[PDB]
Design an enzyme around this catalytic site. Structure first.
Site, mmCIF file in Angstrom:
data_model
loop_
_atom_site.group_PDB
_atom_site.id
_atom_site.type_symbol
_atom_site.label_atom_id
_atom_site.label_comp_id
_atom_site.label_asym_id
_atom_site.label_seq_id
_atom_site.Cartn_x
_atom_site.Cartn_y
_atom_site.Cartn_z
ATOM 1 N N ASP A 242 -24.076 -8.281 -39.045
ATOM 2 C CA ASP A 242 -22.731 -8.275 -38.490
ATOM 3 C C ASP A 242 -22.423 -9.681 -38.059
ATOM 4 O OD1 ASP A 242 -22.198 -5.613 -38.764
ATOM 5 O OD2 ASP A 242 -22.777 -5.085 -36.721
ATOM 6 N N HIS B 89 -22.383 -0.766 -35.245
ATOM 7 C CA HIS B 89 -21.647 -1.939 -35.678
ATOM 8 C C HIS B 89 -20.938 -2.631 -34.512
ATOM 9 C CE1 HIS B 89 -19.366 -4.741 -38.155
ATOM 10 N NE2 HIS B 89 -18.253 -4.298 -37.606
ATOM 11 N N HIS C 190 -24.692 -2.322 -44.529
ATOM 12 C CA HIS C 190 -25.006 -3.512 -43.776
ATOM 13 C C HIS C 190 -26.503 -3.696 -43.623
ATOM 14 C CE1 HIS C 190 -20.930 -3.957 -41.487
ATOM 15 N NE2 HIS C 190 -20.820 -4.100 -42.795
ATOM 16 N N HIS D 195 -25.213 -7.599 -46.306
ATOM 17 C CA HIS D 195 -25.545 -6.203 -46.745
ATOM 18 C C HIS D 195 -26.970 -6.189 -47.226
ATOM 19 C CE1 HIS D 195 -21.339 -4.527 -46.957
ATOM 20 N NE2 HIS D 195 -21.181 -5.793 -46.551
ATOM 21 N N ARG E 193 -14.949 -5.121 -50.978
ATOM 22 C CA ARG E 193 -15.745 -6.321 -51.132
ATOM 23 C C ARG E 193 -15.053 -7.250 -52.122
ATOM 24 N NH1 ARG E 193 -21.698 -3.079 -50.527
ATOM 25 N NH2 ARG E 193 -20.659 -1.642 -49.081
ATOM 26 N N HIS F 95 -15.057 -9.432 -47.106
ATOM 27 C CA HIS F 95 -14.349 -8.190 -47.270
ATOM 28 C C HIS F 95 -12.809 -8.435 -47.282
ATOM 29 C CE1 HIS F 95 -17.635 -5.030 -46.773
ATOM 30 N NE2 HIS F 95 -18.252 -6.129 -46.333
ATOM 31 N N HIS G 159 -25.401 -4.735 -35.943
ATOM 32 C CA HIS G 159 -26.317 -4.824 -37.114
ATOM 33 C C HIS G 159 -26.805 -6.243 -37.217
ATOM 34 C CE1 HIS G 159 -23.332 -1.727 -38.922
ATOM 35 N NE2 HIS G 159 -24.292 -1.070 -38.303
ATOM 36 N N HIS H 238 -20.199 -10.217 -43.713
ATOM 37 C CA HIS H 238 -21.409 -9.405 -43.450
ATOM 38 C C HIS H 238 -22.605 -9.709 -44.352
ATOM 39 C CE1 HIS H 238 -18.001 -6.641 -42.173
ATOM 40 N NE2 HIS H 238 -18.550 -7.108 -41.070
#
Lengths: 153, 153
Positions: A83, A71, A63, A48, A143, A120, A80, A46
């Site tokens: 994403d 999402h 995100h 962020h 994370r 993640h 997002h 992702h």
């Protein structure tokens, strides 16, 4: 910029170098590189919102979602900006990244330079996980490693 | 009001959090933070051109100098956009930063988000050092710690 880079580091053995290329400012961003140190299988990948590491990966925040959508997976229309779905680590913990995305940019309003790329703990459920969390974050876990995206040469 | 943040790190004990804020697109950029683990006295404090940490602070490349000017001090007309002078470490190795600069920006051609802040080994001689190197880098020598400038909350 037409090139960006992220050096992904965390508290554990997860580390990697991710390259971005967008030779056309209204074309796709190509994302390629490598991450090692991971459990076998699928890991959420992702963008962020904040290029802030002042307290580790948590301070990157949510995100990158400036259009305030829900999402999804990168191929979804409802997603997002950040994403980018999953990377896949082999039996040896290595994830060879090869993504092309038309939603993230290296310039303009969807520009992700100065924000944070996160790998993640587990797999991103691409919005289809069957609970309230799935449609906000993808249930991808903690994370493992992160890095502010920078203007590359 | 756009905000940015930098976490500095290197192979040694130098660690710091630097904050940037520019209320207005024309206005002065406030820079502020603390840096610890420095030898007492003065350290070059520069914006280098790439947000590339792939090989440590060395990847960050040269000073951010888009206008091809000679190195000077922040106070000088002739300088790199990147030339933010020297920070001062106290006897316990702690540098308190409070700076205002009107040549760096968080937008435009002179935007530093996605670039690298470097705290150097030596005092930057500000181009007043009497040699060829003085007027390129300010003889600040080694990169003790660096961090890609990222978008802050």
């Amino acid at each position: 910029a037409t090139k960006a880079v992220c050096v992904l580091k965390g508290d554990g053995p997860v580390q990697g170098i991710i390259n971005f290329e967008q030779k056309e400012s209204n074309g796709p961003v190509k994302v390629w590189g490598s991450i090692k140190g991971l459990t076998e299988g699928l890991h959420g990948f992702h963008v962020h919102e904040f290029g802030d590491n002042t307290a580790g990966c948590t301070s990157a925040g949510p995100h990158f979602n400036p259009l305030s959508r829900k999402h999804g997976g990168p191929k979804d229309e409802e997603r997002h900006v950040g994403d980018l779905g999953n990377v896949t680590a082999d039996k040896d913990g290595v994830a060879d990244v090869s993504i092309e995305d038309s939603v993230i940019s290296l310039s303009g309003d969807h520009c992700i330079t100065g924000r944070t790329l996160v790998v993640h703990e587990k797999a991103d459920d691409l919005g289809k996980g069957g609970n309230e969390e799935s449609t906000k974050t993808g249930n991808a876990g903690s994370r493992l490693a992160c890095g502010v995206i920078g203007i590359a040469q």
